């Protein structure tokens, strides 16, 4: 693993740690202090090194969890919840649905869609991010 | 305005470019949420924060020029609006006992990382001082 210096370098060689929308930066913008689940998901969704397990579908703010277990694992590591899993993550996403932030796409599993006005908050359009991230639509 | 402008504007002020990001350091240590010592290392490696916190040029020694400001940013980062240096100082005693941070004897608001921070971070003190254009005191 080496030192932190090596850690940053090793991950840079793998094209990691370059998200378009960093969760910590977004948390500072919204004033939430610690990062929240929706900010974490936007970071993963704008980090090309994460497309193997989470990605945009190409339809607006819709995204899918190709590997829900890996998303839950990374969330647990990010928040020091070693027992984090999809079941708890799903319950969390259910709370976001009540506040009309994230909705589930019927007919497809592990597919969700940001329903709030994300374009006005972030200053990015859905298609703009898709182009940057080389999103291949489903 | 928007988040994009928020990133732009702050970038023009050379903000948000710390050598040791706290969240990145937390990922390296596996701590999950950032901890106070990581938060301090971010500020200490953020050129835009040198007005209220900076190194002294002597190894891992650093000083809090505006101890009230560093506490405000710590409270805003952990949703503690009533955070003040009086409370923040209480939390620093934990790092005293664990021989992570020590107060410089005979100097107030001056501390030093007494752990092998070079082996952890991979940086020497002089290296970060040069990158940060620190003026020794």
């Amino acid at each position: 693993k080496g030192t932190f210096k090596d850690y940053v370098r090793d991950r840079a060689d793998l094209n990691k740690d370059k998200p378009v929308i960093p969760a910590a930066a977004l948390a500072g913008y919204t004033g939430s202090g610690p990062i929240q689940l929706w900010q974490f998901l936007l970071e993963l969704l704008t980090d090309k090194s994460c497309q193997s397990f989470i990605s945009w579908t190409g339809d607006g703010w819709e995204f899918k969890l190709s590997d829900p277990d890996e998303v839950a694992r990374r969330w647990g590591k990010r928040k020091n919840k070693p027992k984090m899993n999809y079941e708890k993550l799903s319950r969390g996403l259910r709370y976001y649905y009540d506040k009309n932030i994230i909705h589930k796409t019927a007919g497809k599993r592990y597919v969700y869609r940001f329903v709030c006005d994300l374009q006005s908050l972030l200053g990015y359009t859905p298609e703009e991010l898709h182009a940057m991230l080389d999103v291949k639509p489903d | 305005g928007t988040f994009k402008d928020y990133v732009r504007d702050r970038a023009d002020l050379n903000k948000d470019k710390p050598v040791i990001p706290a969240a990145a350091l937390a990922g390296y240590t596996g701590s999950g949420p950032i901890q106070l010592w990581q938060f301090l290392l971010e500020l200490l490696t953020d050129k835009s924060c040198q007005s209220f916190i900076s190194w002294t040029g002597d190894g891992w020694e650093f000083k809090l020029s505006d101890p009230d400001e560093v506490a405000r940013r710590w409270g805003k980062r952990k949703n503690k609006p009533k955070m003040n240096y009086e409370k923040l100082s209480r939390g620093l005693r934990y790092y005293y006992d664990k021989n992570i941070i020590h107060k410089t004897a005979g100097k107030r608001y001056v501390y030093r990382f007494v752990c092998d921070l070079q082996s952890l971070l991979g940086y020497t003190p002089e290296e970060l001082h040069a990158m940060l254009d620190v003026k020794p005191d």
Binding site: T30, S32, P34, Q36, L37, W38, K79, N80, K81, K88, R91, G92, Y95, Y96, K99, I101, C116, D117, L121 | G32, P33, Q35, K78, N79
Partner: peptide
């Protein structure tokens, strides 16, 4: 939009 706290006994928010 507003992002009110997400803190429940079945889904507790982390802090420290």
């Amino acid at each position: 939009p507003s992002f009110d706290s997400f803190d429940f006994e079945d889904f507790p928010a982390a802090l420290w």
